[PDB]
Amino acid sequence: TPSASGLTKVATVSAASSLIGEGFMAQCDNPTIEGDGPIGKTLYVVGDFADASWKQKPHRAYRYVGENTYQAVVDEKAGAFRMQYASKDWSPQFTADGLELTPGKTASLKRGGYGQDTAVTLPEAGQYVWSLKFTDSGDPEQIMVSKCP
Secondary structure, three states: OOOOOHHHHHHHHOOOOOOOOHHHHOOOOOOOOOOOOOOOOOOOOEEEOOOOOOOOOOOOOOOEEOOOOEEEEEOOOOOOOOEEEEEOOOOHHHOOOOOOOOOOEEEEEEOOOOOOOEEEEOOEEEEEEEEEEEEEOOEEEEEEEEOOO
């Protein structure tokens, strides 16, 4: 349990008069501070099924989660869609061999830019957030993704 000792007002950096605020946290987006994530590393995801747009915005091409975790918001079509993750300099990629990811399911983090595509059954179009934690020594690796309406 988080409990509540004596915290109510949030500390503001430098200065920012905030009289009104929107429930941004309700969009399923946790605070991503500078942590121990993969620095100097960019991730590229390409979807192919109904659209095949292969779009990857730079502003969200690589988000650092302050907790040895990686996050990247992606927008794809609805109803059976396959996607793959890979870098430009043949760096650590993602390959879901016979994984078949589902809304709110964890995916196996493998390697190789020529494996099996991950198909997700989502009858609703939109962008989902991929949250995954990576090991420090380079042994264990798990991925998790869910859809937020």
